[PDB]
Amino acid sequence: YDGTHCKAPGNCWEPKPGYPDKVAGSKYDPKHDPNELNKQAESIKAMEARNQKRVENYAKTGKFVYKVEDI
Amino acid sequence: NSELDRLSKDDRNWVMQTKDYSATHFSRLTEINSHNVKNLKVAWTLSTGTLHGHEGAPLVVDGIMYIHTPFPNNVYAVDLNDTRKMLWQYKPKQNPAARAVACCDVVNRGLAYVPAGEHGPAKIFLNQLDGHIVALNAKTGEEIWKMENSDIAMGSTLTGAPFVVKDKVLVGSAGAELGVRGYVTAYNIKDGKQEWRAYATGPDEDLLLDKDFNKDNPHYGQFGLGLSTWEGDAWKIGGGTNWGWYAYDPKLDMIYYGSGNPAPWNETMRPGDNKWTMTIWGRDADTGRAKFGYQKTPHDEWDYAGVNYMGLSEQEVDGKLTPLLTHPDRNGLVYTLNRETGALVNAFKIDDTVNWVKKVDLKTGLPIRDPEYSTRMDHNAKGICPSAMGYHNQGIESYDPDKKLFFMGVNHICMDWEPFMLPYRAGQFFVGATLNMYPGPKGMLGQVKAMNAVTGKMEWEVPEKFAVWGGTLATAGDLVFYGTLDGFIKARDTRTGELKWQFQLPSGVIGHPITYQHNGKQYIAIYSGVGGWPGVGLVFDLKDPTAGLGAVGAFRELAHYTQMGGSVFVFSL
C-alpha cells in the first residue's frame, strides 16, 4: 500500500499486507450498532425543525423568539 | 460581501479574523517598522475575565474593538476613544456539559462582522461551544437571532469562527474525535434561516456537488466517492469536521476551506480513502455546490485534520500570472492550487523530516506513502513525522505580496502511535489510539519560516523553544509579529528572520496579532491566555504522558514558563 494503485479515479486504498479487504466478519470488525450510527442525523433533523419554527415565527410577528414552547 | 471587502481595505479596520478575504494577514501600515520596533511599548490593556486558551484575536471596525473569550464565550465591545469602559457585553448561558465534549480545551476562534445594509443593522456573529450561532447588534450587543447548528449530546461543538460572505454567514463543525460527521452551513444574516448545508462524507446529495465537480481534474475523483470509499455505513460517523478558516474570491464567487480527519483515529476500523475527509474545497457562494475538491490525505492514519488556513495570492506559474490558494496542512506539506480550476501547482514539505509521505506526485495528485511510517492495529508505529499535532496547526499565517513570501509558525513534533478497538457511543470519545509525542529530529518543538509557495524555496528558518501555534502578522514595515506558547510576542525582520523585538506577556499565546490605525496612530493587539491542545496538560492538571491525546508528554515543560491567563495587550510607539 503506497497510495498510487487505483481501483478507480479517487479510489486508491488497498489493504496493508496481512490485513483484510473488508472488515465485516474479520477480527477488526467494528460491529457498529446501526441505532447509534443514526443518532447524529436524527438530532440534526430535530435542530433543523426547531430552527424553521423560529424563522417562521420571526416572519409572522417581526419578533425573534428562541424558545419553541413560548411560540 | 462587497461592503465588508471594502472595509477590509481600510487600515483603520480589522474586520475578520483572517483580515481580508484572501487571508493575507498583511498590513500596509509602516509607522512601526524594522528600525523602530525596538521602541514598541504597551499602550493599554484589558482582562477578558476568563482563563483557558484565547484563540483568534480582536476585530476592530469603525472605531470599536470587539473582544471574545474561551467558554462561556463572553463578548465585549470597547470604543477606542474610551478604552477603559465596555460599551456593551453579551454573556451566554450555556450548559456546562459542553466542556466535557471538547477535545482540545474550550477555545473559540472568534467573532465575525457584517456592516449595515438591507438585512439591516451592523452585526457581530458568535459561534458558541454549545453549538449555537448568534447574531448581535454591533453597536448595542442586543441579541437579534440565535439558531442551533450542533448538538453537544452527540459530542458536536463549535470552535471555529463564523465567516460572512454576501448575505450569508457560514458555520463549521467540530467533534471528529467523538465520531461527528463534518458539515458546513450557510445561514441568512437577516433571518438566521438555513440556506444550504454541505456534509464531508456520504451520498453526493449531502456532499453538495456541482454537476461539473472536478471537471478540470477528474483524476481527483468525482461522484459516488463519499460512499464507495467507505465500507457500509461507517461514513455516518466519519469525521471531516471543519473548525478552521476560510477564504473567498469575490470575482469567482467561491469559498475555500478544508475538511478535517476521518473518525476514528484507528485506521483499521475504516478501510477506504474515506472521502471527502482531508479535502481542500472550492464551493459556489450562493448554492454551496463544490466545483472542486482535492483530498490531500486519503485514508488518514495520523489525524492530520485538514482544516488549516487558506491564503490567496496572485503569482507567476511558468511565466503566467495565476490566481492561487496556499495551504500549509497538518500533514507537513504546503499545498498551492489554482483556485479557479483546483489544479495542483505544488506540494512541498514544510520541513525535510516529513516521513509518512516520500513525495506527492504532482501529475496524479497522489501522495506516495512510505509503509515504514504507516499506522495499523497490532503495531506500535515509531518515529512518525509529523505527529497528530502537525508541522502546522490552526494559526492563520501571512503573505507579503512585494516579497512573494509566506511567513509561518511551524511545529516540529513527532510521535509513536498504536491503535485499539472500541465501540462508538453517541456522546463519548471515539479516538482509538495511544500516542507518545516528542521533538522532531532537529530537537526543538517549533520554528518560524519564510518561503515562496510556488517554488518551495525557504528564504529563512529559525528555531523556537515551543511550537508556534497562533499564527502571524506581516507588515510593509518589514516585520512579522507572532506570539509563543511560552508567553512572548515577538517581531522578526522579514528579509532575514532577525529578531528585532520581544515582550513578556503574562501567559502563552495561541491566537494571532492584529494591527490597525486609530486617530492617526498605529497599534498592535493580541490575546494572552495559553491553552488549546499544547496547553491541555497545564490547563487540566494532567500528568500521564499519553493523556491529552498524546500532547501532555511533549508539552510537559510548558508549565515551567506559563500559567493560565486571559488579557488583551495593545502596543504602540
Ligand SMILES: O=C(O)c1cc(C(=O)O)c2c(n1)C(=O)C(=O)c1cc(C(=O)O)[nH]c1-2
Ligand atoms: O476533530 C475535530 O473536529 C477537532 C476539533 C478541534 C477543536 O474544535 O478545537 C481540534 C481538533 N480536531 C484537532 O485535531 C486539533 O489538532 C486541535 C487543536 C486545537 C486547538 O485549538 O489547539 N483544537 C483542535
Ligand SMILES: [Ca+2]
Ligand atoms: Ca481532529
